[PDB]
Coordinates of C-alpha atoms and ligand atoms in Angstrom, one line a residue:
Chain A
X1 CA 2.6 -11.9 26.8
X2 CA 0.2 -8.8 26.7
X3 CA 1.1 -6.1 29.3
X4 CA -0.2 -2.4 30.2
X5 CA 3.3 -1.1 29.1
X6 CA 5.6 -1.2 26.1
X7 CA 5.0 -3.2 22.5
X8 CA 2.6 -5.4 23.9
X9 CA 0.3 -2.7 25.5
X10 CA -3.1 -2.0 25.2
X11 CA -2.9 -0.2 21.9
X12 CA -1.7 -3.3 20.8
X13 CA -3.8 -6.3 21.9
X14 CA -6.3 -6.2 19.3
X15 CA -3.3 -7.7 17.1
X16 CA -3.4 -10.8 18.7
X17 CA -7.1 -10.6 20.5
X18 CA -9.5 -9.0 17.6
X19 CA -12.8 -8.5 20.6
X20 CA -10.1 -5.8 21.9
X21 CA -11.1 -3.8 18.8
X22 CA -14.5 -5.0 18.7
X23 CA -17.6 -3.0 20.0
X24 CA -19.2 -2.7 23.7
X25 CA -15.4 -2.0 25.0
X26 CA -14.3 -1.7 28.8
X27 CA -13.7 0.7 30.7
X28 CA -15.8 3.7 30.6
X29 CA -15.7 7.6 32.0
X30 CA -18.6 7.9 33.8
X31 CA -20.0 11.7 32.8
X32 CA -23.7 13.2 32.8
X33 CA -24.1 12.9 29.7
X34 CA -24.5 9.2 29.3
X35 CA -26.5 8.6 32.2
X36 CA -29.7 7.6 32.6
X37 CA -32.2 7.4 35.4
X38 CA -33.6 3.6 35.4
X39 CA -36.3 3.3 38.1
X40 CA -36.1 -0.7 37.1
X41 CA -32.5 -1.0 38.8
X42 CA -33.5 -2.5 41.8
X43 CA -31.1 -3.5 44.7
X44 CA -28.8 -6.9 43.9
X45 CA -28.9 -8.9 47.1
X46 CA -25.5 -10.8 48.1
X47 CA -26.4 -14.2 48.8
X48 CA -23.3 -16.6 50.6
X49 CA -20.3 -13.5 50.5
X50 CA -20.4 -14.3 54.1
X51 CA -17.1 -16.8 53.7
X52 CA -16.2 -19.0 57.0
X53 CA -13.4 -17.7 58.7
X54 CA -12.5 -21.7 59.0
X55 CA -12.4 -22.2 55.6
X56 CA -9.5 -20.7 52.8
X57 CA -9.6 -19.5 49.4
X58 CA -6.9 -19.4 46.8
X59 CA -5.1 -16.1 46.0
X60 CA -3.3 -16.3 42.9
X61 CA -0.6 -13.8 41.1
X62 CA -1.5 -14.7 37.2
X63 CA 0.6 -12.3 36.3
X64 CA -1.5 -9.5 35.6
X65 CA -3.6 -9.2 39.0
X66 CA -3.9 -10.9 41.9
X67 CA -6.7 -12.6 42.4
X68 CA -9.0 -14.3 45.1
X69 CA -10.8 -17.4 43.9
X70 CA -14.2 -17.8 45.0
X71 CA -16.8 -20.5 45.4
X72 CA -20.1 -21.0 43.5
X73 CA -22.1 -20.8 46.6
X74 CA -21.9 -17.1 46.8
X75 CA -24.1 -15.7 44.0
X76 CA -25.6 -12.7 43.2
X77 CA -29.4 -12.1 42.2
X78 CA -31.4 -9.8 41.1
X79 CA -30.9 -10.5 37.8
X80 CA -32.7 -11.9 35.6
X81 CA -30.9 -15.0 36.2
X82 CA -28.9 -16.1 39.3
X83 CA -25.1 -15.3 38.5
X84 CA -22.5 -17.2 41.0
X85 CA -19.0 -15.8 42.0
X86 CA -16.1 -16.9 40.4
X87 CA -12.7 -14.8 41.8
X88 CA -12.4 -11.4 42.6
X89 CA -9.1 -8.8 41.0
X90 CA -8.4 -5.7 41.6
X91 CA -6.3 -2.8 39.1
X92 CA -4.3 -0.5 40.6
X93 CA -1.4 2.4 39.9
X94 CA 2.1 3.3 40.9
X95 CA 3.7 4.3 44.0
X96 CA 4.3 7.6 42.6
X97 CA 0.6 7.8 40.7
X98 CA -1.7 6.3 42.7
X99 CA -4.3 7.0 40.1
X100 CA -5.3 3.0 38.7
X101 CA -9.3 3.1 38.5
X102 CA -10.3 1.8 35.4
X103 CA -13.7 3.2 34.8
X104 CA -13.5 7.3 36.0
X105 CA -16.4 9.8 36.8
X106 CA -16.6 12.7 35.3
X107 CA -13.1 11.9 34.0
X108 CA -10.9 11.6 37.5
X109 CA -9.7 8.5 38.5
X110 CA -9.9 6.4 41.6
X111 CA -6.8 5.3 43.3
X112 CA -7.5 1.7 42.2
X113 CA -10.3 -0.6 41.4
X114 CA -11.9 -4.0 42.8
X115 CA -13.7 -6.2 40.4
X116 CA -16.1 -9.4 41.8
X117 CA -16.5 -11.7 39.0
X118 CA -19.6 -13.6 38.3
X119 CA -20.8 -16.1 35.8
X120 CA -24.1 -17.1 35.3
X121 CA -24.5 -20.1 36.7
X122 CA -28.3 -20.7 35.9
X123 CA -27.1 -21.3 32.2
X124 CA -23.5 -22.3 32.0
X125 CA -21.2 -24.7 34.3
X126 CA -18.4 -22.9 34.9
X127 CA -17.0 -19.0 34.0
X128 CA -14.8 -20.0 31.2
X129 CA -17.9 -21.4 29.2
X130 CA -19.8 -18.4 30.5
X131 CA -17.4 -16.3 29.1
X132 CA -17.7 -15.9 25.8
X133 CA -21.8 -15.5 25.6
X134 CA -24.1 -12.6 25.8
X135 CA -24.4 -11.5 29.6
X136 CA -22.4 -14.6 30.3
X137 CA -20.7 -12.9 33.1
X138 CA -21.5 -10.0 35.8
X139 CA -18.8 -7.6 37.4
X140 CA -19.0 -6.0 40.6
X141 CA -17.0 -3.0 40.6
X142 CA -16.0 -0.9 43.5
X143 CA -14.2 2.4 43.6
X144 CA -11.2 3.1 45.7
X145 CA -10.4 5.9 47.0
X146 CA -7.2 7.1 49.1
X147 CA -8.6 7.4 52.5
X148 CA -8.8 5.5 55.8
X149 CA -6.8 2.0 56.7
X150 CA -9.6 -0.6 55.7
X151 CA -8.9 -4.0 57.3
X152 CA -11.3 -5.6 55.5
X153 CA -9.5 -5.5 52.3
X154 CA -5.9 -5.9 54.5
X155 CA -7.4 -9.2 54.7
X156 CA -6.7 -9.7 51.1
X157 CA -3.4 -7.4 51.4
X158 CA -1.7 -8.8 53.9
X159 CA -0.8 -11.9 52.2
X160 CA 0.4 -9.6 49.4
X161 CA 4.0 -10.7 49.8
X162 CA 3.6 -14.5 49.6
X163 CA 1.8 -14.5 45.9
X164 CA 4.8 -11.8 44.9
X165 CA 5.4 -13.5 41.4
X166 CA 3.5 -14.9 38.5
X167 CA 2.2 -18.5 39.3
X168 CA 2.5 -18.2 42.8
X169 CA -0.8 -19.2 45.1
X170 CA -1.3 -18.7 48.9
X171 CA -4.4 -19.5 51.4
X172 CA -6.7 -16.5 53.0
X173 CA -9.1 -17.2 55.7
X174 CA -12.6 -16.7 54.3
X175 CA -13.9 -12.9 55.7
X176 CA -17.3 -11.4 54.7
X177 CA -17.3 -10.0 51.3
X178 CA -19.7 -7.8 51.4
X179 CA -17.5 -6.0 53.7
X180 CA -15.2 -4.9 50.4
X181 CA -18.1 -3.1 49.0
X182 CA -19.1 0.7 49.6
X183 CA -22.3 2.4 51.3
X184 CA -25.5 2.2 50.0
X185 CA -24.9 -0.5 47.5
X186 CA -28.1 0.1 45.8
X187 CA -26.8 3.2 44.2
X188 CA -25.3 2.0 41.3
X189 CA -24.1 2.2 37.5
X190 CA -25.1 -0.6 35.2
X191 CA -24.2 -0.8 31.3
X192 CA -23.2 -3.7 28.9
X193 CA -19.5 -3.9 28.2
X194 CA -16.4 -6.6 28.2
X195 CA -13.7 -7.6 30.1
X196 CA -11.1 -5.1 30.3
X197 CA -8.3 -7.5 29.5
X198 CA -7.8 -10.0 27.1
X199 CA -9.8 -11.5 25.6
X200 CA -11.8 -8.3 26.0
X201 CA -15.5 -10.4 25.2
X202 CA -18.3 -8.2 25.5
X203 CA -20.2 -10.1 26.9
X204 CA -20.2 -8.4 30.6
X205 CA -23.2 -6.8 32.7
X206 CA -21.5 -4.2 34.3
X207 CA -22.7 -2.9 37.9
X208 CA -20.2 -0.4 39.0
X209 CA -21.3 1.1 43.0
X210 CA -22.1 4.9 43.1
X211 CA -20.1 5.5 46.4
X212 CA -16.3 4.4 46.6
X213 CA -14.4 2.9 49.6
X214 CA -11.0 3.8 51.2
X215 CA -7.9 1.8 51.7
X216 CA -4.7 3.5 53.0
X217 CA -1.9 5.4 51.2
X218 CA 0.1 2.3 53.4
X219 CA -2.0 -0.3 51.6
X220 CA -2.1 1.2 47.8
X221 CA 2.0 1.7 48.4
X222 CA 1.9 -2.5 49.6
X223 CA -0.1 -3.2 46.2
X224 CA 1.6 -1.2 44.3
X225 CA 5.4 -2.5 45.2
X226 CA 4.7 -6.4 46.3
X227 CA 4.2 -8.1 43.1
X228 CA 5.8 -8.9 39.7
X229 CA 4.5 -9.7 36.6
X230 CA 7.0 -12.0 36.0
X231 CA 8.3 -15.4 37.5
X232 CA 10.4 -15.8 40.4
X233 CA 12.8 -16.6 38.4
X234 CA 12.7 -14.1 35.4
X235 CA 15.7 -12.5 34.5
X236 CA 14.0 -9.7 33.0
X237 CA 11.4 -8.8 36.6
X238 CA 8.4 -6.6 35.5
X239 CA 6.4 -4.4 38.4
X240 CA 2.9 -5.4 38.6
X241 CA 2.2 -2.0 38.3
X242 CA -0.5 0.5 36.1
X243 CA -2.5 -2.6 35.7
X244 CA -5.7 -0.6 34.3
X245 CA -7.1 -0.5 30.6
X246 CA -7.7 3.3 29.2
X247 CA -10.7 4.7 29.1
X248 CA -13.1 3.6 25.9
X249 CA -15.4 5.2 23.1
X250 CA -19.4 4.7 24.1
X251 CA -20.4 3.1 20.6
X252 CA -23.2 4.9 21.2
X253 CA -23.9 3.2 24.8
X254 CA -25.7 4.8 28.0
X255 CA -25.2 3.9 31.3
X256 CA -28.3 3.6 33.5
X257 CA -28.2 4.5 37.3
X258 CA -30.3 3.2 40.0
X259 CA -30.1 7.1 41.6
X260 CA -31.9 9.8 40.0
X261 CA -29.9 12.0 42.0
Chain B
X1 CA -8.7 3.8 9.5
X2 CA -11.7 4.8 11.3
X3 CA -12.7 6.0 14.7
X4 CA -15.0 3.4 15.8
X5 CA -16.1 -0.5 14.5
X6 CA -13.7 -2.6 13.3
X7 CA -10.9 -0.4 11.8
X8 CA -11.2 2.2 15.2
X9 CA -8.4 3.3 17.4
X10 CA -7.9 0.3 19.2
X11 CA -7.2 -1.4 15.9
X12 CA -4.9 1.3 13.9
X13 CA -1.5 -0.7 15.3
X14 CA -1.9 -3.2 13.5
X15 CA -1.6 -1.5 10.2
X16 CA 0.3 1.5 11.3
X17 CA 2.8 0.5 14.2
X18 CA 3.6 3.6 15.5
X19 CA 0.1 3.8 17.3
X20 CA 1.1 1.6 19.6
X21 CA 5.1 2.9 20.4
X22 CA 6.4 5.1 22.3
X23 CA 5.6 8.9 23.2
X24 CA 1.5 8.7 21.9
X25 CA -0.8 11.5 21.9
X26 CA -3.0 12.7 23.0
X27 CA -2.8 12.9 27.2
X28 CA -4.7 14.4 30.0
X29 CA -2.7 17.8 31.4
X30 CA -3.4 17.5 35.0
X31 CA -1.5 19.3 37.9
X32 CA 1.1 16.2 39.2
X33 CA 2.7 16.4 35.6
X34 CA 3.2 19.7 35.1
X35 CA 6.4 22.1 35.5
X36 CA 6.7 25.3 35.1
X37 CA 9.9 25.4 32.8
X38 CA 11.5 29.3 32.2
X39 CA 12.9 29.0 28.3
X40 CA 9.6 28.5 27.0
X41 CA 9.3 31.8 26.0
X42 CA 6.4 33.2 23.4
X43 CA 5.8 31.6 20.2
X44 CA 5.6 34.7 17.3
X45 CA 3.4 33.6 14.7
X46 CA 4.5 34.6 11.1
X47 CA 3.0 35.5 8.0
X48 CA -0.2 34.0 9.2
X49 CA -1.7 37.5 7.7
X50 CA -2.9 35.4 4.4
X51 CA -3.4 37.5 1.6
X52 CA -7.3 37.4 0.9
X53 CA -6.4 37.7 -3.0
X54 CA -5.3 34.1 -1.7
X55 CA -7.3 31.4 -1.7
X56 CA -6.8 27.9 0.6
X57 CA -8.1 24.5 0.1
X58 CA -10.4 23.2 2.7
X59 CA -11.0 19.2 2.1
X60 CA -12.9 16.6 3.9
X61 CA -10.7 13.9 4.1
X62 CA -12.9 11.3 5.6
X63 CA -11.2 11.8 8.9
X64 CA -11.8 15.6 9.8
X65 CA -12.2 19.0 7.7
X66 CA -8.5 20.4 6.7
X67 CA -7.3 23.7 5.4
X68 CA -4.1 23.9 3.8
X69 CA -1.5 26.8 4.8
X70 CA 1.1 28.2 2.6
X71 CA 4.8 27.4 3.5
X72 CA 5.7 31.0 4.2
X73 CA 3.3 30.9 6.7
X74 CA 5.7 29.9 10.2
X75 CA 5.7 29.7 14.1
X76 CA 9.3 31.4 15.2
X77 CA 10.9 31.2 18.5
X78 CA 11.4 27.1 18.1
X79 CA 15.2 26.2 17.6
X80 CA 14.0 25.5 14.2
X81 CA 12.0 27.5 11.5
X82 CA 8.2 25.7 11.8
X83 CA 6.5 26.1 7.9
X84 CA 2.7 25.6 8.2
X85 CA 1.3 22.9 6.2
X86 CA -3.0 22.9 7.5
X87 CA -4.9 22.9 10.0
X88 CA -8.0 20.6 11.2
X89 CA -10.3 20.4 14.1
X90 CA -11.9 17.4 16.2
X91 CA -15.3 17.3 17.8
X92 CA -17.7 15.3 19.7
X93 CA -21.3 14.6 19.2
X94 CA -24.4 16.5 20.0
X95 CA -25.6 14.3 22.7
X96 CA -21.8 14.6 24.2
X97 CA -20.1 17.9 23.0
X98 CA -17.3 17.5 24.4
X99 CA -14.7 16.0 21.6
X100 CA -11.7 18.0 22.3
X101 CA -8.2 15.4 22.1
X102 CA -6.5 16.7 25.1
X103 CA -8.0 16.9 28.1
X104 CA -7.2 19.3 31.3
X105 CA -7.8 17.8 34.8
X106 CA -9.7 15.0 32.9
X107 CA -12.1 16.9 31.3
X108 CA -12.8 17.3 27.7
X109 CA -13.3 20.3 25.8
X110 CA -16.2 20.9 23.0
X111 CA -13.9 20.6 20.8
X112 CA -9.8 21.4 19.3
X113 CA -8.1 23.2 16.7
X114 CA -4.9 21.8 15.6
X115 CA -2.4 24.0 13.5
X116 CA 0.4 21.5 12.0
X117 CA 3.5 22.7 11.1
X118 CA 6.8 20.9 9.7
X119 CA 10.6 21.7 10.4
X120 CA 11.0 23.4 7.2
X121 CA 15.3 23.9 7.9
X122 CA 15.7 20.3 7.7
X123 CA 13.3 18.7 5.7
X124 CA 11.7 19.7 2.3
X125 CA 8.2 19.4 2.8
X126 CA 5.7 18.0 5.4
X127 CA 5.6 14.5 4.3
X128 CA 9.0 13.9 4.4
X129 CA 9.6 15.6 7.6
X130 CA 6.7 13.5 9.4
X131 CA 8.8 10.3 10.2
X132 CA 12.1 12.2 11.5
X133 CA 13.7 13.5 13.8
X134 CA 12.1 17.0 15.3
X135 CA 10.0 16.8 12.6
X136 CA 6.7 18.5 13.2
X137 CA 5.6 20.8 15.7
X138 CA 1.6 21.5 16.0
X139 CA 0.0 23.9 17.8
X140 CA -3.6 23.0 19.9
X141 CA -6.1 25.4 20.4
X142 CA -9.1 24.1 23.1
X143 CA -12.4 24.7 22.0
X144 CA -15.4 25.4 24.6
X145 CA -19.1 26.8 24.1
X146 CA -20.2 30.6 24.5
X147 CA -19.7 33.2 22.3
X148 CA -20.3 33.9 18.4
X149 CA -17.0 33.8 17.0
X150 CA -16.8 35.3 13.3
X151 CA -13.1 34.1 13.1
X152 CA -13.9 30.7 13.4
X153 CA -17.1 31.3 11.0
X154 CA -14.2 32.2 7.9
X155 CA -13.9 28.5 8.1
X156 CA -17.3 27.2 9.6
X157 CA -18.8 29.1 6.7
X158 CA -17.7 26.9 3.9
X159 CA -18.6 23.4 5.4
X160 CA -21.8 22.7 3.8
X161 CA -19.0 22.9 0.1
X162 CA -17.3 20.0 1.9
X163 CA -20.0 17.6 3.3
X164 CA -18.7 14.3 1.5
X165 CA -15.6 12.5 2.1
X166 CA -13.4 13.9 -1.2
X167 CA -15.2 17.2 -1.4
X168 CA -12.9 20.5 -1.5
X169 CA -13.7 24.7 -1.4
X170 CA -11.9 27.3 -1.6
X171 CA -11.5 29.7 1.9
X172 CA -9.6 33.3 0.7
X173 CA -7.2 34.3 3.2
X174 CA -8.1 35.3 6.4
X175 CA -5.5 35.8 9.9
X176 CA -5.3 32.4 11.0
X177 CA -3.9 34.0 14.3
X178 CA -7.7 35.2 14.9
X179 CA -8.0 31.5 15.7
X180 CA -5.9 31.3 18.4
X181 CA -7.0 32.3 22.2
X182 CA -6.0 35.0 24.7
X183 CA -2.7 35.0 26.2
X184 CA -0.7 32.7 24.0
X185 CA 2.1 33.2 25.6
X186 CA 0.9 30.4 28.5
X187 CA 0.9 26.9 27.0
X188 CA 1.8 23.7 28.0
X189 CA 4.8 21.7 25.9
X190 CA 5.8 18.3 25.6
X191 CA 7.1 16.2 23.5
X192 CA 4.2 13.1 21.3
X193 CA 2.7 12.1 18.7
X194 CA 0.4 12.4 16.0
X195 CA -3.2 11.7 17.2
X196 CA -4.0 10.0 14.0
X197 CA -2.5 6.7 11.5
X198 CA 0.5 6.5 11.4
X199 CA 0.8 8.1 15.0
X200 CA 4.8 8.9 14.4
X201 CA 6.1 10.0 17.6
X202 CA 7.6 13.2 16.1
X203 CA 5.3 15.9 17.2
X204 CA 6.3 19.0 19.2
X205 CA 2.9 19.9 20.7
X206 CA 2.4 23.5 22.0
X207 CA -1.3 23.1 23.7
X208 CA -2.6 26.9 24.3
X209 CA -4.0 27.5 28.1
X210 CA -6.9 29.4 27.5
X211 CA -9.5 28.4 25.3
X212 CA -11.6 30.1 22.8
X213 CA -15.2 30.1 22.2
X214 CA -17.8 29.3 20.0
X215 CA -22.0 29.6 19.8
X216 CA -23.9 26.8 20.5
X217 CA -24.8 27.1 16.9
X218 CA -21.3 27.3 15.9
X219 CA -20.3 23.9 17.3
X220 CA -23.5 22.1 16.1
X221 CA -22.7 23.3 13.0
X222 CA -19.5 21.4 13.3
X223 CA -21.0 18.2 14.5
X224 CA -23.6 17.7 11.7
X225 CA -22.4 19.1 8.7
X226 CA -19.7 16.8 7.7
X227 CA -20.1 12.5 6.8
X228 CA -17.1 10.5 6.6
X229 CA -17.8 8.9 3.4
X230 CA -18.2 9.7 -0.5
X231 CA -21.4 11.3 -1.3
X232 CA -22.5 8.1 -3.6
X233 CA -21.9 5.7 -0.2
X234 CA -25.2 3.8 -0.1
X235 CA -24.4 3.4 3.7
X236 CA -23.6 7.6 4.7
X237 CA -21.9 7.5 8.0
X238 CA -22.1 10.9 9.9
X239 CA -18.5 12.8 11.2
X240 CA -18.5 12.8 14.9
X241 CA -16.4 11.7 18.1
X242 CA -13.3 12.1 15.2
X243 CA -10.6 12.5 18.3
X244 CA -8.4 9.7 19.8
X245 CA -8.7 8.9 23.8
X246 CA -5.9 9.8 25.8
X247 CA -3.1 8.0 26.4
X248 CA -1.5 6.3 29.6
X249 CA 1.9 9.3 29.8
X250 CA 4.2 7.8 33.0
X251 CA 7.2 9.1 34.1
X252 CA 7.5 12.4 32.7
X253 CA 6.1 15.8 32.8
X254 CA 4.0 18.3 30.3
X255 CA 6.3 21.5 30.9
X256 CA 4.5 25.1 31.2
X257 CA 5.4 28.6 29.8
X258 CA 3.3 29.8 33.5
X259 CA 3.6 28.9 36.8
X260 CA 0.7 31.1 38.6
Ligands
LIG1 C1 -7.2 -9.3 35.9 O1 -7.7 -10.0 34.6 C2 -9.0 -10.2 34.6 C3 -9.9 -9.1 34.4 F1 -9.3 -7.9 34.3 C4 -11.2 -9.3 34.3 S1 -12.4 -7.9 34.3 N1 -11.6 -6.6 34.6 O2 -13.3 -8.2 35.4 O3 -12.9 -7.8 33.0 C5 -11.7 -10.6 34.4 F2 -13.1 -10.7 34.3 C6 -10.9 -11.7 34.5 N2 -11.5 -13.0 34.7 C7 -12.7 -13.5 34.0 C8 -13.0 -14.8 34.7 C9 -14.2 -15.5 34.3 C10 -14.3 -16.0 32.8 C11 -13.0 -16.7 32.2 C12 -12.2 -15.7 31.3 C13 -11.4 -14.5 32.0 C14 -12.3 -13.5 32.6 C15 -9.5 -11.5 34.7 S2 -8.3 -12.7 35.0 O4 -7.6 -12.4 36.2 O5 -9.0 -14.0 35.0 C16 -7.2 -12.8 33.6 C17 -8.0 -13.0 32.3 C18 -7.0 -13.1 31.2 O6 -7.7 -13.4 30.0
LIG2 C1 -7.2 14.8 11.0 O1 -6.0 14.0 10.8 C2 -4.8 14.6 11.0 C3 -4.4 14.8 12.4 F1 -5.3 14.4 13.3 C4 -3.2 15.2 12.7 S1 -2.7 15.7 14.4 N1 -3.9 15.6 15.3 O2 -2.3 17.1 14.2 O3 -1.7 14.7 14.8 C5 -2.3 15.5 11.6 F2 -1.1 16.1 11.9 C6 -2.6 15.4 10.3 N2 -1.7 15.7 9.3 C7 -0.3 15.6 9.3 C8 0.3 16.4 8.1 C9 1.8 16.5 8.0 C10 2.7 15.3 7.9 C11 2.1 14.2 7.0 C12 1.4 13.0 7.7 C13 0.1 13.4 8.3 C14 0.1 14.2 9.5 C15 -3.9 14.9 10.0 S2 -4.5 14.6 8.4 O4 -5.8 15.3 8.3 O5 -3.5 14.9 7.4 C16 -4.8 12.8 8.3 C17 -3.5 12.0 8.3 C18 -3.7 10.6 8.1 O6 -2.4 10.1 8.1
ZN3 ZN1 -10.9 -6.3 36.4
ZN4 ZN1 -5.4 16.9 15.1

């Protein structure tokens, strides 16, 4: 029952999920300060996000996010172990505050926020086993900024209003993946951190992409007014709405950048 | 109640419920929530002149360093009569200066002065005012780097007395309204929280416009002088980052005293 608004906000879920008070927290402001030039940050390369166009993937409303569910054939490497995709999410604002990054640079927020999800699949079997042990799991994150219609992700949006409640699954077309994420993807942000929902584990590598992409004010308003929180049949609907975790303290981290400059 | 490990912010609802209600501070102050609102018209800041045959007690509280003001000491211009009670600051770290509790357009300041006051026409004293209606209205001063300020030294001046958690001096009276920036007329106004256990959602916040400043010394001086625990802790943790992120503030607006 934990939500972004109301008694069972964020301020709150450490109540019932202690790792949401724990260290190594998610999200992060991304500021000078904390960065760090790390010539070892080499480029990941994107192995299978090329998904047939004759196959179809599960998009889910789990009440919280929608998500895309993806297959363990697409991996990424160039860590130290191969890590495989498991769904991708994305966090978002309001109609009338389009402002729902979770991490922001040099304190502004994006208009929303994309998040691939992998597990490492050299060690562990599946994500949920992955989840809960150190580096267990990789997120991609991309930036999104108002800007220019993108039909890559439309692909995603424009089953929007088919997955409108909590529970509720519909079919995409496999598209190309990579074709979510920004310019020069070897500029990049990498620190350790968690999930930025409950359970809140720490137990993420974080690689968030220097350069955002745009989506349309057309799309964010679709995202932002299509889905509920809540089952079709609630009596008590909820907007899937401001669906992004504050800001958190460093702990003392740095984040380390592939770009010196 | 800490600001980081176990007993940090993210943890303080569960012993102090407020922190995660309604109306939490503090919030970013960013152009789309502001509004330009015509009654709020200057603060005058009374009796704030203290008598330097006076003296005030500066603590470390294990939280922050805190002066205590005399109760004839008041903000008019509020519906209500405002009595001081202390003031306090909150600060960063030296590898990130910038510890201030509201932010402006996202960014942080060095650091922030708060002045706490209580409603002194309907409650007796500040403790008993804290949980009630229009109970306490405190005034936020942004700090940022650049000049010596000798103002701010009347209190800097006396940390090294106050290093420990428990530890106390006394500061003679000085003009607390040295302390506060240019132009006071412009401030933003809304309507929170405290920023600290138990978080009551009874704050009036006044948050200046302009900031002061400080040396470079000045605000190290802040950042390393003080620990957070009793001088005999066998484990000394160091005072820093004591200021509480900001909160998610939908739906409304932080009213202005200025429109240009
Ligand atoms: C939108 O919610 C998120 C989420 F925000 C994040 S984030 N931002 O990447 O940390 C997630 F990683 C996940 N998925 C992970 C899947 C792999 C491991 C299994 C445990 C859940 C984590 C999810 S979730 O949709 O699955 C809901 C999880 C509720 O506990
Ligand atoms: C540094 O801690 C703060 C503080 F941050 C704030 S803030 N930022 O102005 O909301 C405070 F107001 C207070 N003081 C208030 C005094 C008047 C009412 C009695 C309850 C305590 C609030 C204090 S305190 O040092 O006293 C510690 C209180 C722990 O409960
Ligand atoms: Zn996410
Ligand atoms: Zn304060």
């Amino acid at each position: 029952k934990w939500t972004y608004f109301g008694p069972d906000g964020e301020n709150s879920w450490s109540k019932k999920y202690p790792s949401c008070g724990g260290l190594l927290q998610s999200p992060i402001d991304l500021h000078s300060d904390i960065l760090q030039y790390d010539a070892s940050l080499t480029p990941l390369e994107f192995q299978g996000y090329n998904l047939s166009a004759n196959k179809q993937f599960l998009l889910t409303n789990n009440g919280h996010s929608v998500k895309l569910n993806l297959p363990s054939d697409m991996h990424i490497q160039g860590l130290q172990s191969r890590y495989s995709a498991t769904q991708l999410h994305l966090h978002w604002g309001n109609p009338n505050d389009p402002h729902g990054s979770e991490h922001t640079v040099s304190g502004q927020h994006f208009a929303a926020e994309l998040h691939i999800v992998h597990y490492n699949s050299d060690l562990y079997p599946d994500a949920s086993t992955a989840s809960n042990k150190s580096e267990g799991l990789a997120v991609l994150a991309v930036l999104i900024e108002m800007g220019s219609f993108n039909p890559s992700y439309d692909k995603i949006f424009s089953h929007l209003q088919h997955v409108k409640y909590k529970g509720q699954e519909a079919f995409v077309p496999g598209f190309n993946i990579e074709e979510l994420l920004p310019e020069r993807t070897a500029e990049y942000y990498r620190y350790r951190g968690s999930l930025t929902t409950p359970p809140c584990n720490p137990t993420v590598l974080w690689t968030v992409f220097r350069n955002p992409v745009q989506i349309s004010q057309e799309q964010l308003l679709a995202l932002e007014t299509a889905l509920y929180c809540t089952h079709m049949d609630d009596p008590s609907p909820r907007e899937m709405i401001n669906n992004f975790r504050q800001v958190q303290k460093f702990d003392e981290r740095l984040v380390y950048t592939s770009f010196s400059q």
